RNA sequence: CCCGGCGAGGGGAGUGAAAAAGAACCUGAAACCGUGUACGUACAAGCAGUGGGAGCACGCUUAGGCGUGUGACUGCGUACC
RNA sequence: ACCGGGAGAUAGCU
RNA sequence: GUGAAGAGGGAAACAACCCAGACCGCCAGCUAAGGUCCCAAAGUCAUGGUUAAGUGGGAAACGCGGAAGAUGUAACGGGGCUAAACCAUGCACCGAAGCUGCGGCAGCGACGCUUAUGCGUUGUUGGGUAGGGGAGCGUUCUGUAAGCCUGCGAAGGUGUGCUGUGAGGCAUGCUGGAGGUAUCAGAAGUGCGAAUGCUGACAUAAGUAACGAUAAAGCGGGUGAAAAGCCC
RNA sequence: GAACUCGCUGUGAAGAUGCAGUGUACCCGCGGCAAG
């Protein structure tokens, strides 16, 4: 029961009830988003995507929370040129649970 | 440095001198009379506009007793005040030193920092005229 | 999410038999190296063994084209003084048929502990008969 | 007004050393070499944040080629079939699905073969 | 019951006592005493004295059952050193712990 | 005769692996006095093989 | 009081709020030297790290593949001024 | 020959 | 033109050779130079030709010869290749920090709601030595401050968690057992990694030579716990 | 300065333990020959 869908230019293969990680989405925390774009449907008999974004398939993902990702420090230094600068970064992330995939 | 390969008295050396040791100097600044009087007018205007100022016909104590002054302030519902009057009153000055929160000075003794620090200022019938003619 | 990885203790590896006779030395060596590396399997991973054991039969009767019979030479410098021990291809194949295949396969594989682990899976003999009849090694067609 | 720098220097040294844990002895305790080690590690991480994509793409390419060769088609021909079939599925998804499932990959490869011509 | 005995500012090198100490760690007190008595190194006498003091303290403070004492921990630490012309004399701090369990 | 680099503590520790001593583990009990002693040596009390000696 | 040599030193008892204040006596970090615990290493070549990374021990959502501790192997990587 | 002072002497460079 | 002061990919290594100007993050896709026998990601891909010699994988003038090159083949990067060498014609793939897709930050402009003087759009830029300009963080003291916290635990020390693009900030366990100081302005002995910089401490070299004229000690007893070094 | 301090070929501010290729070597001690 795995389906492939893309949200922020990255494809993800997810099943029903499996949380997935995606880039920042402009959706409410307590609301659900319907991705009309699908790349694969898996079942007793699969439904190959003869053309992109098969209409028969759709994904329903409910947002559970938001927040900042793990801290990552990026430092630039140069060979005996006296260049040195470091800065932190925390990419925004969104975790969404998928409940039911249309065939 | 008291003393006498390099030198022992070099600042880098332990127990040596200081590279840029200072000398006794005075930091007093120059303030224009016009600028000072303008600042005094501005502070007085702000003080009156917020209603920090209290004016009475004559504020004095019959006897040089601090308890009497404390009672007079208590019935007036004022604790931290600056009493500014005209001719210095012997009894008030004598019975005002012990109360740190309360300060008394003559008309010519007004200073900006004193006005800022103290919550309220208590003038007199003649002190208002004295300060008005002083500022000009 | 994490990409799938091959656990060394849960890898399904089988055996195979390759006949060296009638096959070009370089091409068969390359194929054997590819199979040892496990690249053919869909679970390839460059930090864990995933290939299948290979048994080579009749290494002495290997087929090589051109004048490689005499032109080819083998050199190893043990050390000390005058370590210039030459080995002509004919002499080596006559005396040590297995060493040519072993060195070729070792060269085709990486250098390091992983490469040694890959090479240790290969067995080579100079005759059809082999003692590894208990593993049921399916013949390899190529 | 004399000011003592002990607190600031100690805090700086503690903070820099806390990031130099496990560097084979001297690098993990001596500030002089710990600073150089941490700077070099930061540069290496900066390069790795971009080399990771290359490494993972190469691994996916290898896995896809391995899966396709079994079905009887080269990787290049498989990609040609996928592209000519108007399929935008990336290599990462195919590599992920080739190990967990085989029927789906078989369908993809046979479709690629059919659409190649 | 755990008993601890220590000796401070020993007239011996810091590391020359660890060699004797290794023969004590993990060994029963009964055999440890004999091993130290029959050891030849100079620090052997100091280690034996420390162990004897430890067992005496254990038996005096503890009720009874001296025979089941095993040396659990023992170590030697750097001590204050004496500086002279250029020469440095080291000192050793011996620590021993004896406990039935 | 001059070291260009300072050997690390690990190398020094490795070089000191052979300096460990050996336990005697050879205590033999006297036949009569019943006190253990080093083999082939008179006891402190002055006994050996059970036979008596000066034992000053 | 006991060990210790009628020593140095130490362990109990007591005073002391505290002896994690003992005359070497407020606070006591690093360099440096140790014991224990967890993991790796005796077929493995190089500025000693960086990503991937199975494995191994503990606590957690009592699994749900989470964190900490080490890092077999692998691509890359020729110190500071 | 050594001690204190001119002297924190003077030029360039490191 | 490049380096100086531009990262990255390729030419095995390499700064001046080819492609290619790094705002930050993502396990997405398409390309430039160069590659698609393995090492190592990609065609043991197709078509028409040359090569029998490993020339390819080093060489002139000159009648295929000319041809002799470096510890070891060592002038293929290793194997190995008779095509896995070269020429020309194609469809594909790999191929960077180049470009595109998603997300985030900042400068520079422009548009308007015009503001309450910001907001919503909008294109562009974001390598950097010397240098210039702008914006901030850390500590001592002064007034704020006879305020506040604090023996129900201050400063300091030592771990953890959460925080911002940064120097840093807050909470808390333990040790500490008496000071610290909100907000806002002022003065600075104001932020350390090197100057064969200086005081103190701690190391390796290391349990390493030496124990110093090559006049020589042996034994019994005594003191002492301990005696080749003391006394008889 | 830090070290988990091998040989050969090649390049390199020009004889490379550290750069490209390849080969050898179980971990750790003790005594000398001095090519470095």
Residue numbers in the entry:
A (entry chain R): 1 to 103
B (entry chain E): 52 to 55, 70 to 201
C (entry chain J): 1 to 142
D (entry chain Q): 1 to 117
E (entry chain S): 1 to 85, 95 to 110
F (entry chain 0): 1 to 56
From the primary publication:
The E. coli 50S large ribosomal subunit is composed of 33 proteins (L-proteins), one 23S and one 5S rRNA. The 23S rRNA consists of six architectural domains that, stabilized by the L-proteins, define the shape of the 50S subunit with its three protuberances. Here, we present a biochemical and cryo-EM based analysis of the earliest period of 50S assembly, utilizing an in vitro reconstitution system with purified rRNA and L-protein components. Taken together, early 50S assembly occurs in a domain-wise fashion, while late 50S assembly proceeds incrementally.
Once densities for domains I, II, III, VI, and their interacting proteins are present, the large subunit´s core has completely formed (state C). While state d1 can mature to d12 and d126, an alternative route involves state d136. Both states d126 and d136 can convert into state C (d1236), a process we refer to as core formation, that enhances base pairing between the 5‘ and 3‘ ends of 23S rRNA. Hence, initial appearance of domain IV benefits from the presence of the maturely folded domain III. Specifically, rRNA contacts with the already formed domain III helices H56-58 seem to induce formation of domain IV H61 and H63 in state d136, and H61-63 in state C, thereby initiating the incremental formation of domain IV. Subsequently, state C transitions via intermediate steps into state C-CP-H68 (48S).
